[PDB]
């Protein structure tokens, strides 16, 4: 437990302002990031048209 470290994984934004909406959105357990952290650093495979269609059809979880 003492030696446990994050090693730079999933080091997303950590809000400091009290009224920043992220400070509540990240607290919300049912929050989906735009892309998974491992995939955030991997090359895209879908074509431009497919990506645009997926983004257009995407719906916010709330």
């Amino acid at each position: 437990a003492l030696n446990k470290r994050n090693w730079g994984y999933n080091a997303h934004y950590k809000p400091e302002l009290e009224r920043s909406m992220k400070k509540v959105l990240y607290a919300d357990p049912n929050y989906k990031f735009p892309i998974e952290w491992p995939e955030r650093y991997m090359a895209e495979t879908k074509t431009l048209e497919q990506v645009m269609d997926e983004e257009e059809n995407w719906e916010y979880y709330k």
Binding site: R5, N6, W7, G8, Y9, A11
Partner: protein, 110 residues
């Protein structure tokens, strides 16, 4: 001392050179890397990072830490495997990294 050093150099560099001299059907790369590991991973040019503070000052130590991480980022490197880790703080004083392993990128030390 010179004779022992020369014997070690021979064992690592001269005799293994003759093991493979033609293309190999099976496991050619494996055998080539087997014969090359003993020569390319000699401690003379690998050991020393464990006591890098002898020559690297704190700020210089952090800069050289990031530089070495970038240089040895390549996974396929037995020399990097045998080299001492760069994920550590200067023993005298650290100014950049407060805790080891608490980064924003798995590769960049900062």
């Amino acid at each position: 001392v010179c004779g022992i050093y020369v014997i070690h150099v021979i064992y690592n560099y001269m005799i293994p050179y003759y093991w493979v001299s033609t293309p190999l059907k099976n496991d050619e790369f494996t055998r080539l890397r087997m014969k090359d590991y003993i020569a390319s991973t000699v401690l003379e040019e690998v050991y020393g990072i464990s006591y890098a503070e002898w020559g690297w000052l704190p700020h210089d130590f952090a800069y050289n830490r990031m530089r070495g991480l970038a240089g040895y980022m390549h996974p396929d490197d037995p020399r990097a495997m045998c080299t001492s880790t760069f994920h550590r703080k200067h023993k005298y004083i650290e100014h950049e990294v407060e805790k080891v392993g608490d980064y924003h990128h798995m590769t960049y030390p900062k």
